[PDB]
Amino acid sequence: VPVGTPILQCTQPGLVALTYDDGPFTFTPQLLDILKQNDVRATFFVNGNNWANIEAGSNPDTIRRMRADGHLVGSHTYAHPDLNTLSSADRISQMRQLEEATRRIDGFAPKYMRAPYLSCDAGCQGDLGGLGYHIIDTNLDTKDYENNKPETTHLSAEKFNNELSADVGANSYIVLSHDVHEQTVVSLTQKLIDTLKSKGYRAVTVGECLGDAPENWYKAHHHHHH
Numbered sequence: 001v002p003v004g005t006p007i008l009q010c011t012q013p014g015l016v017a018l019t020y021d022d023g024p025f026t027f028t029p030q031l032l033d034i035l036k037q038n039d040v041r042a043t044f045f046v047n048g049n050n051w052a053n054i055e056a057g058s059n060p061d062t063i064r065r066m067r068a069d070g071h072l073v074g075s076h077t078y079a080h081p082d083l084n085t086l087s088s089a090d091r092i093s094q095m096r097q098l099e100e101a102t103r104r105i106d107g108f109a110p111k112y113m114r115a116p117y118l119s120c121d122a123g124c125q126g127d128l129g130g131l132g133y134h135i136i137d138t139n140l141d142t143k144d145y146e147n148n149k150p151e152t153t154h155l156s157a158e159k160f161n162n163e164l165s166a167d168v169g170a171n172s173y174i175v176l177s178h179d180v181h182e183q184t185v186v187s188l189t190q191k192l193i194d195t196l197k198s199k200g201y202r203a204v205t206v207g208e209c210l211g212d213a214p215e216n217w218y219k220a221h222h223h224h225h226h
């Protein structure tokens with residue numbers, strides 16, 4: 001799987017990787033329950049301290065359930081800054097801080113990440129590559145953060161349907177949603193699953209989307225010497 005270079009689609013067609021950024025937060029437990037009931041795995045790009053602290057409250061338990069249920073856990077940086085705007089030392093710190101938290105939680109560090117605001121240019125990419133990260137972008141943005149009211153979430157479900165080509169054999173998608181919005185969880189997610197199966201796609205983690213064995217998704221161990 002490419003390192004230090006933004007990835008937009010799967011390595012095979014007929015696949016959808018549903019992804020969720022900016023958690024974990026209030027609605028994430030319910031989202032895990034919904035995905036389980038659907039037998040669907042997904043991918044979470046998590047922060048360390050953004051809408052909540054990943055080590056506060058039940059969040060450590062939600063992160064542990066993500067892994068237990070087979071969802072891919074990726075980094076979204078610790079504090080959600082625009083990585084372009086930081087010096088290399090500060091970008092390295094944003095990644096390592098999150099890795100230290102996920103190691104405290106469940107003894108892992110992500111090899112997968114997504115840049116806040118999809119903002120990560122060649123300067124940023126070089127550093128992330130030196131850290132051995134896979135950079136995950138999107139080729140289908142639900143705009144769920146804009147369509148986040150009971151009466152407007154259908155616009156995001158429609159956007160998904162519109163963009164999801166009926167031509168299952170020639171296409172695959174990495175889908176951007178944000179589970180920190182209640183409507184993303186209690187309405188949009190079921191519609192995404194329904195719509196993707198109605199067209200013949202299979203939902204997959206980004207790991208499977210890119211042909212990557214789950215044994216490669218994480219650094220299972222800290223190297224004492226770098």
Ligand SMILES: [Cl-]
Pocket residue numbers: 226
């Ligand atoms: Cl290093």
Ligand SMILES: [Zn+2]
Pocket residue numbers: 021022076080115116117
């Ligand atoms: Zn974000």
